[PDB]
Amino acid sequence: AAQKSFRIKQKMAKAKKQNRPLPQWIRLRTNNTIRYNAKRRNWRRTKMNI
Amino acid sequence: AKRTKKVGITGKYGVRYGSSLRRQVKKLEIQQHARYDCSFCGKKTVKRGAAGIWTCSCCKKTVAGGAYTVSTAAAATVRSTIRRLREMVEA
Amino acid sequence: AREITDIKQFLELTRRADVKTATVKINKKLNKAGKPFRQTKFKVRGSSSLYTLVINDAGKAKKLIQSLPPTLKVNRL
Amino acid sequence: AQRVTFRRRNPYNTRSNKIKVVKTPGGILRAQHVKKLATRPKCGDCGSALQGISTLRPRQYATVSKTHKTVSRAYGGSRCANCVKERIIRAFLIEEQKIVKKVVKEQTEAAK
Amino acid sequence: GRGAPLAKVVFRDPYKYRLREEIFIANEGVHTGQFIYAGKKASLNVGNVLPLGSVPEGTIVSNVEEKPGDRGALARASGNYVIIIGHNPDENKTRVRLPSGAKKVISSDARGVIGVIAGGGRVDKPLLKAGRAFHKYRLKRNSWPKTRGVA
Amino acid sequence: RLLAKYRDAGKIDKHLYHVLYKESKGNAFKHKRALVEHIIQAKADAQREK
RNA sequence: UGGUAGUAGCAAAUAUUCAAAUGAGAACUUUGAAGACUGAAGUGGGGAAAGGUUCCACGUCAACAGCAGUUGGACGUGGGUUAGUCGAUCCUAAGAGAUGGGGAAGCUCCGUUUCAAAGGCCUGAUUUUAUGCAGGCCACCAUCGAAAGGGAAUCCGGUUAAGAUUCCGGAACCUGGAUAUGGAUUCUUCACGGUAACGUAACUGAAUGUGGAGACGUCGGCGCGAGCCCUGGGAGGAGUUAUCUUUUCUUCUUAACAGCUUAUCACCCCGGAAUUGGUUUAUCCGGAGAUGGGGUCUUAUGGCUGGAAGAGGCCAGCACCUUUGCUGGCUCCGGUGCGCUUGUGACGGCCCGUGAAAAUCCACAGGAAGGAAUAGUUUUCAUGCCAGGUCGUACUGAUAACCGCAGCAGGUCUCCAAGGUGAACAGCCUCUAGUUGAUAGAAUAAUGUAGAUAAGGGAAGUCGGCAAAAUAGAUCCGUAACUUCGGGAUAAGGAUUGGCUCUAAGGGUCGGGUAGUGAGAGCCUUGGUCAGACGCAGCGUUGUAGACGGCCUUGGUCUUGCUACAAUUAACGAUCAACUUAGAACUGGUACGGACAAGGGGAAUCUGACUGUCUAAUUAAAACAUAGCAUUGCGAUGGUCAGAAAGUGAUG
């Protein structure tokens, strides 16, 4: 941490690209129940445990 | 002067440890920290480290000896026994 | 990184076919305690180190500037 | 004063991580990491450092010419001179004394 | 962790050209540069190592083998020694006296080095403080301090 | 080093050097001036015994 | 979902104020002006562990920031981490763990060099031979395990909204591989010099062996070096000026690398010692050869030069809607040290503690093999050429970025380190740096918490002087019983302590002559000789300076050979930095360790000898430990103990 292996950084890359809200166009789509993103992992609330 | 009356070097221990024990440790530190004659170079330069080891300061030698003195009294007789025993092989 | 005292060694270096760049630097320093005078430094770039030549008397320096081969690219100051 | 920092990423005061403080041409104090000090080669027999040998770290000795690693005697960069002198004297005199051991037993074995 | 000092005696390998270094327990009074003679016909001087069938009785040897070739079992700690008190040349046995005062008959092909063991009189000095016993037992094993089982 | 340079100037011989050196190793000399006075004292004594 | 209740409360960390800007709206945002704080064992600069985007920018104010909000470690959208040299990679440590084997119904257990036929290395065979075969050797015997141990290699300056020992400019070095050009050697084929210690840019060398480096505790003082601190002269810029002050602050810097040179230590040669002598703060050395004289060596260091002033720094001018500068200067000469920190050299103390290993690299012994000159050898000499892969790199490292459910007065390893007082890294105040954040306003009742101060008496309070008070720094005097003779002891108990003007002591560096002479190895100067050259200036012109100087000199030009006189005596004269100690007057509303800091002591008893250790969240003790004493078992086909077993295991 500040000096890392590669595997942990690869999972941080995935944890970055998932840390975003819904696309705005899905809420218009037919038969939609998804109203927000129920998996927003912040860094002040949830530690991902690698 | 003579700064201590009867403790000597064991005055570094102080008031602790009894009197007979400090007298007993004195008896062996006067042998241990002393400076002995080297039998080969003839110089009084033998000091010890590392109990049982007597390194000459000059002359590079090292005598494995007694732990506090260069050759203890129960050892220096043994070689005289050897001096008795090796003479009977020839005569 | 090196310093050269000889002149003919420097002339041997300027024709060594790796030396593509040289430069002439003109310093303004003072002799023994009194007077300002003109020092020059000839720096040839060998491919490993940068050789120099320190000339204090400029009466050798004008002859030496003339004595450089003209195929050598010279940065003047 | 100007308080300085480590340059590498090792924060502890180990034997590898030593620091000199140097003024740099920008005027500022800055740290310089200093390699451990090289030790002189020693005689294997008398323990004295033997002279004529450049004192370098052990992989520096492959960057150097052979005359900074050697003196011009037999047993040059390995043993100090006196010991070499002694192992000539001894190695002469016994190989004279042994010849005495070959001249006594030509006569004592013959006069028996 | 050992009261006696060692002795790194170096021998010539008889079958390949090299030197083999061997760690004896130093007897008392072996200066460095002493030639140490291992073997049957070796003379009887302080530091030589000999078979027990080659020495006379009353000889004060140490580092003596139990069975011939286990390389130094009996009488190794500092100050100690065994004393050959008799021979039995029939079926080549030797009767010795161990440091505890137990007499014992062993084989006369076992090897003992002549002389008492260097470092003698090590426990005649008091160990005055607890820290000195700590620094004694930090180099042997974890057997200190001993809590009483009544406590 | 004052005894050293007085010997190197030849003002004092080496016998009195080896006496006054071991005396200076004790107290025997409160300062520089007392030692100069003690040099001149013993030198005048050996001069009167000459 | 209530009553409770719009109450308990949002009070530790000395602390905020004024004006302007944005805005619907500023106790809280931004700038400026004040005022303070941490005060360099910092509320400062970097990091390890940990977090993972929080770093940085634009926009937004629903929710969160237990008040506020136009602000944010929030929300929305994007941007950002560049390495041959930093680390990981490689090595082994305590240890883990295959293979061979041995158990176990089996999951799996033991063991790690072991009851195992456990593999590669260079030369020859080549011109079927592709690189197999004929040998000569050698035997170690997996693998993992330390981004704090071992280790091949870099630094400076600049640069971005966020990266830099990584990018850019310059300057280097290491490893691996190629081949040439020189130089060296050679018909004395595989170098010479030095009495020697050893030196030279080079100066064959296999298998095998040996040695060195890697390789190393801790404490103490001494020497040297670096950086900081302090200080003098000089060259700039700012502040103060009612008065005074040659004033107060600030800038004046130099890297990696390379060449030459040098300091202890060590060694060689001549030489010979007692009328014992060298010599350290610390007492060790010398006929196993001192002191003395002359040398050799190492180079962390230091110095000079190159890098490199063309860099950075501090100023000045001419300007410039803006872009962007351009032109100039200077950047110099020193000194001190029980100073602070740090590195090291030689020592000295300590031990029934004597204080890692391997990789890697080098050297020597050895002599296989190969090599001459019409030229073969030489890449551990100079130069040149080519290449250096992968992964990490942003930021915080904490009274908001980690863990404690939280933006929790807790907890978490380390480096740097300023001025004054002062013994001090104590407390107290300031500089560089960073903050000004911890809901506010008004009053200031009871009872609280935190700090105080009290007439007279003095523990009479109380289970008990519990809590406070009192002493306390330094200097000088004086110090009992008892004792293991070391202590007890800062025992007890007294006396001083400012400011000012002085006095005495405590140290260094060079000079030890007059006269006649040589070189005054300064040669000045008058004269030139011709390198009299660089460069300036002007319409090769034919003017400028000759660097105002190698070279030749008629001498007035404070270092001296040789002797004269006789040189020698008291040992001096000049001169410069340190502070320490002792005393005297004089003076102050009798004060003066003026704040801070900072022992109460004695007479005894019970108990444990002591230093130490534990019930982390009620027990820190007379308990546990301890050294000391004593006992018991055991001679390894063993004593104590483990295992479900084993061709097992701990002490070992």
| Distance separating alpha carbons of residues E121 and E63, to the nearest angstrom | 18
Token representation of residue B62: 């090292």
- Length of chain B, in residues: 91
Give, as one character, the DSSP assignment of residue E117.
Answer: B
Distance C16 CA to G180 C1' (A): 14
Instruction: List bases in chain G with any atom under 7 Å of a protein Cβ.
Output: 40, 44-54, 73-77, 86-87, 138-139, 147-158, 165, 170-176, 191-194, 196-203, 205, 208-216, 226-229, 251-259, 266-268, 275-280, 282-286, 288, 296-300, 305-313, 342-345, 348-354, 359-366, 380-381, 383-385, 391-397, 402-403, 406-407, 413-418, 484-487, 505-508, 531-535, 547-549, 570-572, 609-611, 623-629, 634-637, 651-652
| Distance separating alpha carbons of residues B44 and B38, to the nearest angstrom | 6
Task: Compute CA distances B25 → B30, E132, E147, whole Å.
Answer: 9, 13, 27
Distance C36 CA to G302 C1' (A): 30
Q: Where are the beta strands (DSSP E) in E13-151?
A: 19-25, 30-31, 49-51, 60-62, 82-88, 93-97, 103-107, 111-114
Resolved by: cryo-EM
For residues E113 and E63, the answer to whether their CB atoms sit within 8 Å is yes
Q: Measured between alpha carbons, how far apart are the two ends of chain E, in Å?
A: 30
Which of chain B's residues have a Cβ under 8 Å away from the Cβ of E125?
24-25, 28, 68
| Distance separating alpha carbons of residues C62 and C53, to the nearest angstrom | 14
| Distance separating alpha carbons of residues E82 and E98, to the nearest angstrom | 5
Secondary-structure percent of chain D, ordered helix, strand, coil, rounded to 5? 25, 10, 60
| Distance separating alpha carbons of residues F23 and E126, to the nearest angstrom | 41
For residues E64 and E109, the answer to whether their CB atoms sit within 8 Å is no
| Distance separating alpha carbons of residues E78 and E84, to the nearest angstrom | 19
- B83, amino acid identity: R
Is it the case that chain A and chain B have 3 or more CB pairs lying under 8 Å apart?
no
Q: Exposure of E75 by Cβ count < 10 A (0-12 exposed, 13-18 middle, 19+ buried)?
A: buried
Q: What is the residue whose two structure tokens read 């430094």?
A: C41
Distance B12 CA to G564 C1' (A): 73
Smallest CA–CA distance, residue E3 to chain B, in Å, is 7
Token representation of residue B17: 């440890």
Which among B24, B64, B79 is the nearest to E5, CB-wise?
A: B64
Which of chain B's residues have a Cβ under 8 Å away from the Cβ of E114?
82
Starting at the edge strand that comes first in sequence, how are the strands of the sheet with B62-64 ordered? B46-49, B53-56, B62-64, E30-31
Token representation of residue E67: 């069975």
